[PDB]
Amino acid sequence: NDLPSSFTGYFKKFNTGRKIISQEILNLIELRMRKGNIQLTNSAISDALKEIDSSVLNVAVTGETGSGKSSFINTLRGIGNEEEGAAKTGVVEVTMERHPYKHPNIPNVVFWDLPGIGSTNFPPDTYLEKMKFYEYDFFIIISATRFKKNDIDIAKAISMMKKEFYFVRTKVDSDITNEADKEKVLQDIRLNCVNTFRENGIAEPPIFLLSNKNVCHYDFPVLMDKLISDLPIYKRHNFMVSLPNITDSVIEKKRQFLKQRIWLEGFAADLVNIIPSLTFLLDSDLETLKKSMKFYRTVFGVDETSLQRLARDWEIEVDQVEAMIKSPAVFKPTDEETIQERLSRYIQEFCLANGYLLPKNSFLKEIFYLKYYFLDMVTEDAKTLLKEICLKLGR
Ligand SMILES: Nc1nc2c(ncn2[C@@H]2O[C@H](COP(=O)(O)OP(=O)(O)NP(=O)(O)O)[C@@H](O)[C@H]2O)c(=O)[nH]1
């Protein structure tokens, strides 16, 4: 009801698995706001943001040759096996070495292509030392069949390291085009695998069936969703904005994480008692806003580049695509209206639709209502295009 509750209350609308900050740290903050420690209150918030931003993710991807490591690594990086920078390493092995692949627009996220353990005379242990297992947040164990012994021995060596690991069963689509002229045809895969684990002295483990081709029609949505949950809270935000924008819910989950960061930021910069109006912009604020808009656009796959490589796929004109959404106009110069008049209208619209988000007479600075507005605009666009991207399919 008062400010301290308003601050932590904002996070109530996000279930445990989608919080960008821990409930313990949140209470420690509300606590300081109540004890009257402006030092530690702005300090706490500030460190939580620094730790959230500076988080570096390192995903190890392992498995036999042709299991699907390259395509998985590319699918998460949101790029085609052909596109520039794609992890087009079928049977590299011109070096039985570990290969790193950064995320195109979201650095801090790095996938590692690990040479199958069966391509080296290294025992389950020696292998992970050379591969530097200690450098990874989690492991993606990929298998085409129903997993081999090697896969289990790796997991065992990994769990003995307190590290996370996930069993991903790829090529399911390539196993459906052999039973058509889905149903329990999946149970099969789900069974062979479960029988392999029950064959290597381990309880039944979670398994994620999926096709790199049909990027979002199986356990893929559940996996990505699970990776985020299992990640230490502070590591969530950076890996979440990097995931592929496959479903509305994925887009939405991204907005929810980003809404939370805008909130933490607004409070860090200090609340004000003057109603937002943007009567005077300021060049430093305009530059910040321009970067925020650019970032969000990248994250939701609606930036300039992404729109270009979307027109050639529809044989339409870039400008034609841009007209389909609203995010690209915001900073598009016009003789008819100033960027100030426009931004001013944005704030007014926003606050009339959402209120000020805080108790009476307390408001975030103008720049943050704007950042929320841009966030809504950009997520809607993503859902717009994505939607149109689904009509023109192959079925
Ligand atoms: N249908 C289908 N094909 C797939 C899938 N994944 C990989 N493929 C195909 O299988 C081949 C081998 O997969 P690839 O990505 O090279 O796996 P890899 O694990 O990296 N091989 P290596 O272990 O030797 O490095 C490629 O022809 C690719 O087109 C999939 O999920 N569905």
Q: Which of 64, 71, 111, 209 to mutate to test the pocket of ligand 1 (most atoms within 8 A of CB)?
A: 71
**Amino acid letter at 57?**
L
Side by side, the strands of the sheet bearing 207-209 are 99-102, 109-113, 57-62, 138-143, 164-169, 207-209
Residue 156 buriedness (CB in 10 A; 0-12 / 13-18 / 19+): middle
User: Which residue bears the tokens 């069949």?
Assistant: 145
Q: Which atom of ligand 1 is nearest to the CA of 210?
A: 31
Q: Which atom of ligand 1 is nearest to the CA of 91?
A: 24
Residue 138 pairs with which residues in a beta bridge?
Answer: 59, 164
Q: Which atom of ligand 1 is nearest to the CA of 170?
A: 31
Nearest CA to ligand 1 atom 9: 68
The tokens of 213 are what?
């081709």
User: Which residue bears the tokens 């356990």?
Assistant: 219
Give CA–CA dist 224/244, Å, rounded. 9
Give CA–CA dist 257/289, Å, rounded. 18
| 311-338: b (≥16 Cβ within 10 Å) or e | eeeeeeeeeebbeebebbebeeeeeeee
Contact 171, 144 (CB under 8 A): yes
The tokens of 120 are what?
């080296």
Give CA–CA dist 151/158, Å, rounded. 11
**Amino acid letter at 252?**
E
3-state SS assignment for residue 352: helix
Write down the domain spans for the chain: 1-55+232-395, 56-231
The tokens of 273 are what?
């008692």
User: Which residue bears the tokens 């300039």?
Assistant: 304
Using the mean position of ligand 1's atoms as its centre, give its distance from the Cα of residue 322 in Å: 34
Resolution (A): 2.7
Which residues lie below 8 Å from residue 151, measured CB to CB, with a gap of 6+? 63, 141, 143, 167
Give CA–CA dist 344/276, Å, rounded. 9
Using the mean position of ligand 1's atoms as its centre, give its distance from the Cα of residue 98 in Å: 17
User: How many C-alpha atoms does 354 have within 13 Å on its Cβ side?
Assistant: 15
Residues comprising the binding site for GDP? 66, 68-71, 89-90, 171, 173-174, 212
DSSP code string of 25-66: HHHHHHHHHHHT-HHHHHHHHHHHHHHHHT--EEEEEE-STT
Contact 124, 157 (CB under 8 A): yes
Q: Which fold does the domain 56-231 belong to in CATH? A: Rossmann fold (3.40.50)
Which residue intervals of 68-148 are DSSP H helices?
A: 69-76, 124-130
Contact 200, 149 (CB under 8 A): yes
Alpha-carbon distances, residue 3 vs 9, 47, 168, 350 (angstroms): 9, 20, 45, 21
Other residues' Cβ atoms within 10 Å of the Cβ of residue 355? 8
Give CA–CA dist 262/45, Å, rounded. 12
Give CA–CA dist 171/209, Å, rounded. 8
Nearest CA to ligand 1 atom 21: 66
Residues comprising the binding site? 66, 68-71, 89-90, 171, 173-174, 212
Nearest CA to ligand 1 atom 6: 68
The binding-site residues of ligand 1, defined as CB within 6 angstroms of any ligand atom, are: 63, 65-71, 89-92, 116, 170-171, 173-174, 211-213
